Design a protein around this ligand. Structure first.
Ligand SMILES: CCCCCCCCCCCCCCCCCC(=O)OC[C@H](COP(=O)([O-])OCC(O)COP(=O)([O-])OC[C@@H](COC(=O)CCCCCCCCCCCCCCCCC)OC(=O)CCCCCCCCCCCCCCCCC)OC(=O)CCCCCCCCCCCCCCCCC
Ligand SMILES: CCCCCCCCCCCCCCCCCC(=O)OC[C@H](COP(=O)([O-])OCC(O)COP(=O)([O-])OC[C@@H](COC(=O)CCCCCCCCCCCCCCCCC)OC(=O)CCCCCCCCCCCCCCCCC)OC(=O)CCCCCCCCCCCCCCCCC
Ligand SMILES: CCCCCCCCCCCCCCCCCC(=O)OC[C@H](COP(=O)([O-])OCC(O)COP(=O)([O-])OC[C@@H](COC(=O)CCCCCCCCCCCCCCCCC)OC(=O)CCCCCCCCCCCCCCCCC)OC(=O)CCCCCCCCCCCCCCCCC
Ligand SMILES: CCCCCCCCCCCCCCCCCC(=O)OC[C@H](COP(=O)([O-])OCC(O)COP(=O)([O-])OC[C@@H](COC(=O)CCCCCCCCCCCCCCCCC)OC(=O)CCCCCCCCCCCCCCCCC)OC(=O)CCCCCCCCCCCCCCCCC
Ligand SMILES: CCCCCCCCCCCCCCCCCC(=O)OC[C@H](COP(=O)([O-])OCC[N+](C)(C)C)OC(=O)CCCCCCCCCCCCCCCCC
Ligand SMILES: CCCCCCCCCCCCCCCCCC(=O)OC[C@H](COP(=O)([O-])OCC[N+](C)(C)C)OC(=O)CCCCCCCCCCCCCCCCC
Ligand SMILES: CCCCCCCCCCCCCCCCCC(=O)OC[C@H](COP(=O)([O-])OCC[N+](C)(C)C)OC(=O)CCCCCCCCCCCCCCCCC
Ligand SMILES: CCCCCCCCCCCCCCCCCC(=O)OC[C@H](COP(=O)([O-])OCC[N+](C)(C)C)OC(=O)CCCCCCCCCCCCCCCCC
Ligand SMILES: [Cu+2]
Ligand SMILES: [Zn+2]
Lengths: 284, 35, 53, 115, 51, 157, 60, 133, 245, 247, 28
């Protein structure tokens, strides 16, 4: 044992005796890193060998479980037009962003010397013009403008993608119907594919019981949000019969609706006695 | 760590946080763990 | 510099306890001899005075 | 002229920032990390520490005034803001008022810890 | 009641070194119009290059 | 074992010792946040700055030793710069560093009874930002924008 | 009930404040702002053309 | 008690769900435990181990550390420039002309400054520019 | 706003929650507020002034003698290093100090010192939805207000680090252990109720309750109204969730 | 983002023809400054995910927030006090017009100015209240809306700040009737001192807004990387918005 | 020199690893 810091009850659990990962069957390639961030020599906390060397349990295998079969199956849900909408909105925002962030500031900052009204309406200076060259001799505005442009564009693109990341462009079962391949919107409007386990998908009731009235699913053409609980992600489907495959729709609905039960409303005078199962003590 | 191997490269992403001549990364430049 | 005196007294329960009159300092922990030896010198110098916080 | 005087003014600004860091650190060290019996009793602490804390409160009071005075001097030197030019509104005496309002407490904070 | 605090501030030491460099260099350049002649002690420049 | 490089082994141990000592010094005195080491560094920096202020006062007293400007030899502006630098670095960069930096950082954790200070990072930052202001205030007597002396023929360059 | 009332109040706050902001913007979109206020404050003829010219520098 | 009726998966592990009530799962796999329900929280353990060790203190963002190139460039430049500052301001102020260069750059509105030239190429080029407004 | 300690509290957060919910002298002494430590008696050989340490061999102790009303301190602040092993006294005033080195256990010896600690304040526990009050009059003394409620239906169970890792990475084991502990909580509550019934039978009621007839009638009316509104909410929820139940 | 940023940086360098070596040295220094500040803050954000963020640490960071904003409100308070009783010439003969220089600005224009700041305050409160029952991807709408509004406010404040700093160089056209050519003349400016004091106050306001904008950008990047929003940083940002509105 | 030490990698036994019986709870 560490004679300066440790105790004699310091016995390492061997890697054989540690608990295997059984929570899910899908692999978790984050522990590998990426060829990109291995090439860039980036150090991440999620693929550090010391932190992945858990002493009591095992981290999940990077590859999916050998029992899983990834052969294509029945198509469940298909709303492809979302992609187009995605493109539209994304492109619109970008164009608007450009017009509202670069063209107008550029034209009113470099292509004229006359101020606009909002530059001096609250000031009590006499009227004067401005020049780009008699100010900021040591150019501290150049790094500021560059950083603002870079990070504003990054934030805009990333959060636009995050907003669209809930919606499901397409959802197709596996052959054994144990997996759901979900095509979603990429940052630039095209497709990106993910995989989920149907066992982890649940249509969870709201935490606030009074907010069930204020749901999209109340409408006949609203949205149905199904939570993947092994990753805490959301699958937003259009609840219109034209977007669904009738041959698998009822099975999917039955498998995903298990926690939205009658207890969510409460127990009446008769069900309160059956709310729990009695614990019998001393009967031996 | 010069001529003496104190650190454990099996427990570090990047060996080379300190000037040394006795350490080598387990995942080298051309190595990429993949599925 | 650990204890300046020792005194064996029996309390009201008749336990015959001992009381150790420590070596003190006047308002200044910097002037306090934090030692563990029966000597008068200040041999130990601690970089971290409150080691365990 | 442009040179040593500007060096002095901006170095006084930097010294004000450094004093800000110092008094903030030490005052919050007393006000937050004091031992359970010495949270509020000034008398219990050694006299040098009482003096230091009093002088740090004085520095906290007086530092912004000196900082404002030297920033105004820099603006007057390099932007012609005429803060201390009598011709069109300014008054040179205001600079002396601000500086000495900083300055006498500075000598007191220099002397009290030796007490 | 306070969590464990890291006992070294390397990024802080280097940020303060950079603050000192900024202050001296910028003030000399703005007011004295001076830039240090790094080639006068060329071996310090080499130590920078060698490192 | 008749190894041919015993002296080489000794030199290898010396190199390892030097690198270990470099790492130790950096981690213990430069990168540290310990208030006692920071206070001692403040005291030594204050020794250097006090010597600087004493040199400036020596210049002042050598100019005033007898009339006729024996030290600066008729350069009144240099004398005024020396006086200003002396006052500023004696007030703000000798006594204030000594008292506040050294004694405060050393003794407040003792007297108040605290683990280091509230902002150990700010303590280290204050100590390591002192030198730039010290140099800027103390070296104005050597520097002027027109650095050339009266016998430097500026018409040649 | 505290959680549920917080949700209901969040809905109320969202609707009412969004309506208030939109009404504010629409009002100032349709309101004809008076731009005919006096501009004497911006004009200082003694300072715009310095009346003490050539005398600000010490000359007598 | 609305018991979990059936798990249709072929994974015999997921059969644990059928034992518990819907309300029981809703309490410990949703609501308060939403960010934990039905998930193996190995990443919590990995991130805890990342946080509590004496790792590299140069963090770029949450996911990655600072690239070692930037770190080493910053540290080497800091040490060398600080040494230059100290040595020059303590030992090499006797001849300002020898140990210093005079540099300057002004606004584009004003005519090009006398010292607005590239250093180390004073014997090669005369630098000038057209004024702009 | 209260931390879900199953997945988030690991070492210092976990120890703080242990100190809050158990009030164990070791844990409570680690996390005792620096602002105020509970005032104690005057140290005597029969009744020594007890200074606690959480498994540390010594502690710095300052003595100001017999504190009085006119002057808050008896004599000058004299510091010493109170060590572990015996009684020690301040020769200036004779105050006897005993260093009690608290252990990380649940022995009856530790519970003996349960009354020497301020209960741990829960206001700063959890996560705050207000940074700091901008009012100068109420600042550094008042805690920040919250827009949310503090739940009171949390029952904390201690687990070993190995078992906590297994709970985190094995949802099935987590559900199994949670249901077992819920059964244990039901059994414990029923046992306490039965004990109270036996005690009330043996010794009778403490006394009658001084109430008004108006308040009596209003309490009964409030209970009936609460039941009626619960029934109405049950019907409304059943109608709202019809498409999902 | 890199294309736009690098093109903008190169254009801003090219139009001014800055000396590459000097400006690149300056930019390296500034980059190290800002990067080490942000790296320390990222270190603090990463460390407190598990087993470090106790009640003492949370109270410490609340105190740190209030201490920083109190320190920044001292110099601004001194400048505001000097602005109130700004120096002026005697009213009898030197300055007979300052009686009528009330410097009153229309309240209707001010009210239309105030809309984005109150908008972001209300949106931030709604974001922090609904964090109890909402996810990260559902709140990205509010986060992005606040980000865009902050960009709008940043442009407006920078425009006014640029105008104010452009006041102090009087650049005019002078006609030379002898040469029949116009020339560009540069001069100083004289103005009432209250204008200079309020200009200094507005410079301080702009720099404080830049600080809170960097605060918000840091926060949104961190919440995007972590994958969820937490109460402390969010409520700190909302209080930053309120303080900048007050300023 | 001694190697790295992480005390969190070793099991500690502060809580019994079995749960009490219902009858034992009532009797206790
Ligand atoms: C062909 C000609 C057209 C190519 C471009 C258009 C491709 C189709 C399309 O609509 O792409 C949109 C799509 C939009 O991105 P998205 O929103 O993420 O959607 C992609 C999905 O998420 C899905 O993304 P993903 O993760 O599945 O990756 C898709 C794509 C991503 O592209 C890459 O990986 C390109 C690799 C270089 C990247 C450099 C940066 O990767 C591949 O296609 C795999 C690599 C194939 C390499 C084959 C090399 C063969 C060499 C000879 C062997 C013998 O863009 C791409 O797929 C990449 C465009 C091309 C690379 C960048 C070129 C420079 C920058 C241009 C823009 C400024
Ligand atoms: C509030 C915000 C305030 C912001 C700051 C405001 C003030 C800005 C002042 C700007 C000028 C400051 C200054 O004196 O800079 C030195 C100096 C500025 O240029 P200069 O004024 O023409 O030089 C005259 C000096 O007296 C230097 O005299 P020298 O002739 O001895 O200098 C030569 C020396 C200059 O060496 C250095 O300055 C050392 C630093 C090199 C940094 C390299 C970074 C590479 C990675 C970049 C990414 O070596 C080289 O140029 C080649 C070094 C190869 C390694 O910096 C440089 O020359 C470095 C430029 C980048 C070189 C990259 C080589 C690859
Ligand atoms: C100096 C005022 C008189 C002269 C006229 C000034 C005219 C200023 C016009 C420009 C500002 C207009 C309003 C801007 C938006 C205010 C945003 C806001 O949340 O304000 C309420 C907000 C109260 O929120 P809180 O501090 O979290 O509430 C703590 C307790 O729950 C409750 O604590 P509490 O009951 O002690 O009251 C806290 C607070 C209640 O706030 C008020 O009554 C608002 C009064 C104006 C606040 C701004 C004045 C200028 C500060 C510079 O009162 C004060 O801070 C003192 C009055 O107060 C401030 O933001 C005041 C900041 C400055 C405090 C020191 C003032 C000396
Ligand atoms: C005083 C006046 C101040 C005015 C300030 C104006 C600007 C305001 C915004 C400043 C930034 C605010 C902020 O939150 O910064 C956080 C940010 C760190 O977060 P982040 O990594 O950007 O997070 C972005 C995503 O959330 C996460 O990004 P990600 O995970 O997608 O990507 C990770 C990242 C990781 O990239 C790296 O670690 C860099 C790799 C290349 C390093 C090359 C170094 C070469 C050195 C020798 C030459 O990139 C890569 O792995 C691939 C490279 C992509 C391009 C990177 C540029 O701080 C900085 O980057 C500091 C920049 C300071 C520049 C000062 C210039 C003067
Ligand atoms: C303390 C309070 C007082 C502080 C005063 C500081 C000194 C004065 C000052 O502010 O100088 C500013 C200095 C410049 O001062 P200056 O030297 O140009 O001043 C003008 C001087 N005369 C008139 C004599 C020529 O720095 C800057 O202006 C840098 C601006 C950086 C921010 C730019 C943001 C652009 C991106 C956002 C908009 C686009 C979005 C899309
Ligand atoms: C950091 C803070 C610094 C201090 C800021 C203090 C700002 C002043 C606030 C207090 C004094 C307000 C005096 C208003 C007097 C108006 C007189 C008049 O005839 O107005 C007609 C004017 C006429 O319109 P006008 O404003 O366009 O004026 C005509 C144009 N000039 C300027 C040339 C005369 O205003 C109106 O009719 C509409 C606005 C009415 C005034 C509103 C006052 C609000 C006061 C409280 C604000 C803050 C509340 C905070 C709550 C918490
Ligand atoms: C929702 C967007 C909220 C943010 C405000 C956007 C304002 C756009 C209108 C405008 O005039 O912009 C230029 C103006 C500047 O033009 P300006 O200086 O003439 O100001 C016009 C507004 N007044 C006159 C009332 C002050 O705003 C900007 O430049 C803001 C820069 C950041 C823009 C952020 C991205 C917006 C993306 C919109 C996508 C739409 C599809
Ligand atoms: C400069 C611009 C960027 C500033 C970023 C400040 C980040 C502060 C930080 O790391 O806070 C840690 C923490 C991180 O909070 P958190 O939301 O990540 O919570 C961590 C704890 N868990 C995840 C378990 C809930 O921030 C706070 O507690 C916020 C309180 C205000 C902090 C203000 C600090 C800055 C003060 C001025 C500095 C100049
Ligand atoms: Cu005086
Ligand atoms: Zn005593």
């Amino acid at each position: 044992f560490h004679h300066d810091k440790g105790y004699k009850y310091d016995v390492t659990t061997p890697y054989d005796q540690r608990y295997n990962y059984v929570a899910d069957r899908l692999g978790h390639p984050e522990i590998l890193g990426n060829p990109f961030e291995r090439l860039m020599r980036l150090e991440g906390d999620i693929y550090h060998p010391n932190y992945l060397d858990q002493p009591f349990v095992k981290v999940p295998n990077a590859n999916p479980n050998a029992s899983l079969n990834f052969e294509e199956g029945e198509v469940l849900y298909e709303n492809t037009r979302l992609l187009e909408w995605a493109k539209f909105w994304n492109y619109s925002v970008v164009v608007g962003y450009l017009w509202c962030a670069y063209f107008v500031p550029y034209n009113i900052f470099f292509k004229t010397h006359m101020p606009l009204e909002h530059a001096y309406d609250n000031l009590f200076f006499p009227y004067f013009q401005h020049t780009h060259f008699l100010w900021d001799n040591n150019a501290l505005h150049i790094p500021t403008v560059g950083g603002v442009a870079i990070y504003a564009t990054y934030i805009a693109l990333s959060y636009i993608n995050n907003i669209w990341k809930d919606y499901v462009v397409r959802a197709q079962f596996s052959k054994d119907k144990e997996l759901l391949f979900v095509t979603r919107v990429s940052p630039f409007g095209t497709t990106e594919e993910e995989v989920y386990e149907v066992a982890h998908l649940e249509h969870l009731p709201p935490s606030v019981r009074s907010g069930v009235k204020d749901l999209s699913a109340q409408d006949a053409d609203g949205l149905v949000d199904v939570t993947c609980m092994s990753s805490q992600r959301s699958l937003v489907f259009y609840k219109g019969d034209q977007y669904w495959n009738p041959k698998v729709y009822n099975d999917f609905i039955n498998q995903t609706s298990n926690l939205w039960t009658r207890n969510y409303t409460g127990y009446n005078r008769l069900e309160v006695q059956n709310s729990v199962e009695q614990v019998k003590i001393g009967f031996s | 760590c010069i001529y003496q191997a104190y650190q454990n490269p099996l427990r570090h992403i990047n060996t080379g946080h300190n000037p040394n001549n006795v350490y080598e990364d387990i995942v080298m430049l051309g190595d990429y763990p993949v599925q | 510099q650990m204890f300046v005196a020792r005194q064996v007294v029996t309390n009201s329960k008749g336990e015959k306890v001992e009381v150790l009159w420590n070596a003190q300092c006047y308002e200044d922990i910097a002037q306090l001899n934090v030692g563990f030896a029966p000597v008068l010198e200040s041999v130990d110098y601690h970089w971290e005075i409150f080691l365990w916080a | 002229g442009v040179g040593s005087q500007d060096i002095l003014i901006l170095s006084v600004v930097f010294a004000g920032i450094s004093t800000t860091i110092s008094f903030t650190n030490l005052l919050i060290t007393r006000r937050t990390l004091a031992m359970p019996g010495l949270r509020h009793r000034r008398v219990l602490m050694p006299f040098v520490t009482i003096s230091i804390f009093l002088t740090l409160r004085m520095l906290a009071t007086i530092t912004p005034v000196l900082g404002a005075a030297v920033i105004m001097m820099a603006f007057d030197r390099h932007w012609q803001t005429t803060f201390f030019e009598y011709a069109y509104g300014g008054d040179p005496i205001l600079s002396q008022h601000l500086f000495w309002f900083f300055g006498h407490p500075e000598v007191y904070v220099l002397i009290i810890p030796t007490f | 009641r306070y969590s464990r605090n890291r006992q070294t501030y390397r990024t802080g030491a280097y940020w303060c070194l950079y603050v000192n460099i900024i202050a001296v260099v910028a003030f000399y350049f703005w007011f004295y119009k001076f830039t240090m002649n790094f080639g006068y002690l060329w071996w310090l420049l080499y130590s920078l290059i060698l490192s | 074992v008749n190894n041919y490089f015993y002296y080489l082994d000794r030199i290898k141990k010396l190199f390892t010792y030097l690198n270990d000592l470099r790492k130790h010094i950096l981690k213990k005195y430069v990168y540290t946040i310990n208030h006692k080491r920071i206070a001692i560094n403040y005291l030594y920096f204050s020794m250097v700055t006090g010597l600087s202020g004493a040199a400036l006062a020596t210049m002042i007293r050598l100019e005033l030793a007898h009339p006729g400007s024996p030290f600066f030899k008729g350069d009144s502006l240099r004398y005024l710069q020396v006086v200003t630098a002396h006052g500023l670095i004696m007030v703000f960069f000798v006594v204030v560093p000594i008292l506040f930096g050294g004694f405060a950082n050393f003794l407040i954790p003792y007297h108040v009874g605290s683990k280091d200070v509230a902002y150990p990072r700010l303590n280290s930052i204050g100590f390591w930002i002192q030198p730039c202001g010290y140099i800027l205030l103390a070296k104005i007597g050597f520097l002027r924008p027109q650095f050339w002396r009266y016998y430097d023929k500026t018409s040649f360059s | 009930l505290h959680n549920e009332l917080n949700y209901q109040n969040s809905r109320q706050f969202l609707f009412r404040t969004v309506s208030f902001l939109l009404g504010w913007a629409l009002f100032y979109q349709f309101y004809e702002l008076p731009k005919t206020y006096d501009w004497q404050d911006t004009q200082e003829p003694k300072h715009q053309v310095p009346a003490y010219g050539d005398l600000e520098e010490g000359g007598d | 008690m609305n018991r979990f009726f059936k798990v249709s998966s072929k994974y015999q592990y997921y059969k644990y769900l059928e034992q518990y009530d819907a309300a029981f799962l809703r309490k410990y796999q949703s609501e308060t435990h939403w960010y934990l329900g039905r998930r193996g929280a190995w990443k919590n353990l990995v991130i805890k181990y990342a946080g509590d060790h004496i790792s590299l203190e140069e963090e770029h963002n949450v996911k990655y550390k600072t690239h070692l190139s930037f770190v080493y460039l910053s540290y080497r430049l800091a040490w060398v420039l600080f040494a230059y500052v100290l040595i020059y301001n303590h030992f090499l102020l006797g001849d300002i002309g020898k140990t210093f260069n005079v540099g300057e750059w002004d606004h584009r509105l004003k005519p090009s400054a006398e010292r607005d030239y590239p250093t180390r190429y004073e014997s090669l080029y005369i630098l000038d520019r057209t004024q702009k407004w | 706003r209260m931390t879900n300690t199953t997945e988030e509290a690991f070492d210092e957060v976990s120890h703080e929650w242990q100190a809050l919910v158990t009030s164990n002298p070791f844990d409570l002494n680690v996390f005792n507020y620096l602002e105020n430590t509970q005032t104690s008696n005057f140290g005597t050989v029969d009744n020594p002034l007890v200074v606690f340490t959480s498994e540390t061999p010594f502690r710095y102790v300052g003595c100001t003698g017999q504190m009085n009303e006119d002057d808050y301190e008896g004599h000058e602040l004299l510091f010493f290093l109170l060590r572990e092993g015996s009684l020690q006294r301040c020769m200036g005033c004779g105050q006897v100090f005993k260093l009690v080195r608290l252990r990380n256990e649940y022995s009856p010896e530790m519970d003996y010192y349960l009354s020497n600690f301020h209960p741990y304040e829960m206001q700063e526990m959890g996560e705050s939805d207000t940074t700091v009050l901008m009012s100068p009059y109420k600042y550094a003394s008042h805690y920040e207000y919250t827009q949310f409620e503090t739940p009171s239906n949390m029952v904390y169970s201690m687990v070993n680090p190995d078992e906590h890792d297994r709970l985190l990475v094995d949802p099935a084991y987590r559900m199994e252990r949670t249901k077992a502990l819920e059964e244990k909580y039901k059994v414990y509550t029923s046992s306490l109720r039965e004990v109270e019934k036996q005690f009330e039978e043996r010794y009778g009621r403490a006394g009658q309750i001084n109430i008004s007839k108006v308040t009596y009638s209003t309490l009964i009316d409030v209970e009936k109204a609460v039941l009626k509104m619960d029934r109405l909410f049950r019907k409304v929820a059943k109608f709202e969730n019809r498409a999902f139940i | 983002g890199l294309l736009l940023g690098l093109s903008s940086i190169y254009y801003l360098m090219y139009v001014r023809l800055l000396p590459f070596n000097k400006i690149i040295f300056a930019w390296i220094l500034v980059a190290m400054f800002l990067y080490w500040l942000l790296s320390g803050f990222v270190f603090f954000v990463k460390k407190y995910q598990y087993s470090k963020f106790t009640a003492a640490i949370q109270r410490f960071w609340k105190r740190t927030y209030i201490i920083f904003w109190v320190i920044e409100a001292g110099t601004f308070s001194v400048f505001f006090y000097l602005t109130l009783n700004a120096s002026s010439e005697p009213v009898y003969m030197y300055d007979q017009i300052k009686i009528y220089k009330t410097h009153l600005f229309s309240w209707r224009w001010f009210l239309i100015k105030l809309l984005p700041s109150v908008s972001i305050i209300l949106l931030g409160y709604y974001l922090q209240l609904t964090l109890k029952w909402n996810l990260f991807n559902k709140q990205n709408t509010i986060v992005l809306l606040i980000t865009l509004l902050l960009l709008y406010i940043l442009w407006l404040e920078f425009y006014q700040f640029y105008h104010i700093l452009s006041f102090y160089g009087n650049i005019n056209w002078a006609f030379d009737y002898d040469e029949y050519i116009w020339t560009l003349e540069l001069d100083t400016r004289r103005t009432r001192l209250a204008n200079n004091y309020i200009a200094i106050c507005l410079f301080a306001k702009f720099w404080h807004f830049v600080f809170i904008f960097l605060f918000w950008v840091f926060f949104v990047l961190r919440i995007n990387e972590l994958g969820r929003i937490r109460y402390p940083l969010l409520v700190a940002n909302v209080q930053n918005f309120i303080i900048i509105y007050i300023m | 020199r001694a190697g790295p030490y992480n005390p969190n990698r070793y099991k500690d036994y502060y809580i019994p690893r079995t749960l009490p019986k219902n009858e034992e709870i009532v009797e206790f």
